[PDB]
Design an enzyme around this catalytic site. Structure first.
Site, PDB file in Angstrom:
ATOM      1  N   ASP A  25       0.854  -1.186   0.000  1.00  0.00           N
ATOM      2  CA  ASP A  25       0.000   0.000   0.000  1.00  0.00           C
ATOM      3  C   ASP A  25       0.905   1.256   0.000  1.00  0.00           C
ATOM      4  O   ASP A  25       1.317   1.674   1.084  1.00  0.00           O
ATOM      5  CB  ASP A  25      -0.937  -0.020   1.212  1.00  0.00           C
ATOM      6  CG  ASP A  25      -1.957   1.081   1.185  1.00  0.00           C
ATOM      7  OD1 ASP A  25      -1.804   1.972   0.325  1.00  0.00           O
ATOM      8  OD2 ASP A  25      -2.892   1.052   2.014  1.00  0.00           O
ATOM      9  N   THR A  26       1.210   1.821  -1.165  1.00  0.00           N
ATOM     10  CA  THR A  26       2.133   2.961  -1.201  1.00  0.00           C
ATOM     11  C   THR A  26       1.504   4.193  -0.542  1.00  0.00           C
ATOM     12  O   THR A  26       2.238   5.131  -0.219  1.00  0.00           O
ATOM     13  CB  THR A  26       2.553   3.289  -2.676  1.00  0.00           C
ATOM     14  OG1 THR A  26       1.356   3.501  -3.434  1.00  0.00           O
ATOM     15  CG2 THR A  26       3.306   2.103  -3.280  1.00  0.00           C
ATOM     16  N   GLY A  27       0.176   4.224  -0.386  1.00  0.00           N
ATOM     17  CA  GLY A  27      -0.518   5.326   0.332  1.00  0.00           C
ATOM     18  C   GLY A  27      -0.548   5.181   1.864  1.00  0.00           C
ATOM     19  O   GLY A  27      -1.074   6.061   2.537  1.00  0.00           O
TER      20      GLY A  27
HETATM   21  C1  LIG Z   1      -6.736   1.234   3.675  1.00  0.00           C
HETATM   22  C2  LIG Z   1      -6.584   0.971   2.157  1.00  0.00           C
HETATM   23  C3  LIG Z   1      -7.046  -0.444   1.825  1.00  0.00           C
HETATM   24  C4  LIG Z   1      -7.488   1.914   1.322  1.00  0.00           C
HETATM   25  N1  LIG Z   1      -7.161   3.347   1.512  1.00  0.00           N
HETATM   26  C5  LIG Z   1      -5.998   3.783   0.689  1.00  0.00           C
HETATM   27  C6  LIG Z   1      -4.840   3.908   1.695  1.00  0.00           C
HETATM   28  O1  LIG Z   1      -3.616   3.854   1.014  1.00  0.00           O
HETATM   29  C7  LIG Z   1      -4.886   5.185   2.566  1.00  0.00           C
HETATM   30  C8  LIG Z   1      -4.619   6.488   1.810  1.00  0.00           C
HETATM   31  C9  LIG Z   1      -4.769   7.659   2.734  1.00  0.00           C
HETATM   32  C10 LIG Z   1      -3.616   8.373   3.165  1.00  0.00           C
HETATM   33  C11 LIG Z   1      -3.750   9.452   4.054  1.00  0.00           C
HETATM   34  C12 LIG Z   1      -5.027   9.863   4.495  1.00  0.00           C
HETATM   35  C13 LIG Z   1      -6.154   9.157   4.066  1.00  0.00           C
HETATM   36  C14 LIG Z   1      -6.018   8.071   3.179  1.00  0.00           C
HETATM   37  N2  LIG Z   1      -3.852   5.084   3.608  1.00  0.00           N
HETATM   38  C15 LIG Z   1      -4.060   4.741   4.875  1.00  0.00           C
HETATM   39  O2  LIG Z   1      -5.117   4.466   5.368  1.00  0.00           O
HETATM   40  O3  LIG Z   1      -2.856   4.720   5.660  1.00  0.00           O
HETATM   41  C16 LIG Z   1      -3.067   4.195   6.980  1.00  0.00           C
HETATM   42  C17 LIG Z   1      -2.875   2.685   6.961  1.00  0.00           C
HETATM   43  C18 LIG Z   1      -1.465   2.473   7.565  1.00  0.00           C
HETATM   44  O4  LIG Z   1      -0.874   3.774   7.575  1.00  0.00           O
HETATM   45  C19 LIG Z   1      -1.902   4.718   7.819  1.00  0.00           C
HETATM   46  S1  LIG Z   1      -8.388   4.437   1.389  1.00  0.00           S
HETATM   47  O5  LIG Z   1      -7.889   5.776   1.556  1.00  0.00           O
HETATM   48  O6  LIG Z   1      -9.224   4.025   2.438  1.00  0.00           O
HETATM   49  C20 LIG Z   1      -9.123   4.332  -0.093  1.00  0.00           C
HETATM   50  C21 LIG Z   1     -10.167   3.425  -0.382  1.00  0.00           C
HETATM   51  C22 LIG Z   1     -10.777   3.359  -1.633  1.00  0.00           C
HETATM   52  C23 LIG Z   1     -10.388   4.213  -2.677  1.00  0.00           C
HETATM   53  N3  LIG Z   1     -10.992   4.143  -3.908  1.00  0.00           N
HETATM   54  C24 LIG Z   1      -9.353   5.124  -2.439  1.00  0.00           C
HETATM   55  C25 LIG Z   1      -8.761   5.202  -1.151  1.00  0.00           C
END
Ligand SMILES: CC(C)CN(C[C@@H](O)[C@H](Cc1ccccc1)NC(=O)O[C@H]1CCOC1)S(=O)(=O)c1ccc(N)cc1
Ligand SMILES: CC(C)CN(C[C@@H](O)[C@H](Cc1ccccc1)NC(=O)O[C@H]1CCOC1)S(=O)(=O)c1ccc(N)cc1
Ligand SMILES: [Cl-]
Ligand SMILES: [Cl-]
Lengths: 99, 99
Positions: A25-27
């Site tokens: 998960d690069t995000g």
């Molecule tokens: C949790 C994953 C499975 C899914 N998320 C993507 C993730 O990368 C998400 C991206 C993000 C970064 C900063 C603030 C808010 C969101 N990062 C995340 O939660 O970081 C947490 C887990 C550990 O470190 C902290 S999502 O945002 O829910 C999502 C869902 C569906 C779509 N179409 C787009 C986005």
């Protein structure tokens, strides 16, 4: 490996020597699992996602292996809807995004 | 480019005729922007992640310029804390994770 992204990029991950699966998960800044049972005491920690902020358990210096790479890192345990490998661990295994 | 993950992997994209910055996010099924104006019809959708769900507008078949390529695909719009480029868009430019 070099993997495309047509499906969710799950990998096999051995975490505290237990066999699990998690999404690369690069995000995600941090690596988080829902119900691995890691031994010991843990530190309270907060993480933020699309919906708000969760209280998680931080376990320190946990062994993690992915794709033959054996790393020591920080693993959170908390109510994540999916197990994720975050940028902390991915930099340890030399993972890159390419296009 | 080959992007290491020591920092958050932002890119500049053009969408709705505007330059926006978004996180390359292999955990995101679909791309989401906050506060953009797109012309077609949209459909209401929900996305879930850490901390719960978010209401968005789904716009289908929208152009995005990312790197040098025009990608046409689904774009969601809603009050995400950070704009993200999801798998639906990254697959169209042949992005891969390498490790
Ligand atoms: C949790 C994953 C499975 C899914 N998320 C993507 C993730 O990368 C998400 C991206 C993000 C970064 C900063 C603030 C808010 C969101 N990062 C995340 O939660 O970081 C947490 C887990 C550990 O470190 C902290 S999502 O945002 O829910 C999502 C869902 C569906 C779509 N179409 C787009 C986005
Ligand atoms: C961009 C989406 C988040 C808008 N939606 C949700 C609504 O809560 C939305 C929340 C919001 C407001 C302002 C900025 C950002 C978000 N409030 C809204 O716009 O009202 C405002 C305009 C003046 O007074 C109050 S939606 O399109 O209505 C909808 C509803 C249900 C689903 N499943 C999907 C979409
Ligand atoms: Cl105790
Ligand atoms: Cl922006």
């Amino acid at each position: 490996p070099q993997i495309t992204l047509w499906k969710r990029p799950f990998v096999t991950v051995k975490v505290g020597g237990q066999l699990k699966e998690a999404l690369l998960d690069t995000g995600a800044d941090n690596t988080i699992f829902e119900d691995i049972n890691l031994p010991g005491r843990w530190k309270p920690k907060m993480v933020g996602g699309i919906g708000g902020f969760l209280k998680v358990r931080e376990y320190d210096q946990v062994p993690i292996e992915i794709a033959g790479h054996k790393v020591i890192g920080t693993v959170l345990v908390g109510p994540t809807p999916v197990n994720v490998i975050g940028r902390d661990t991915m930099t340890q295994i030399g993972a890159t995004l390419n296009f």
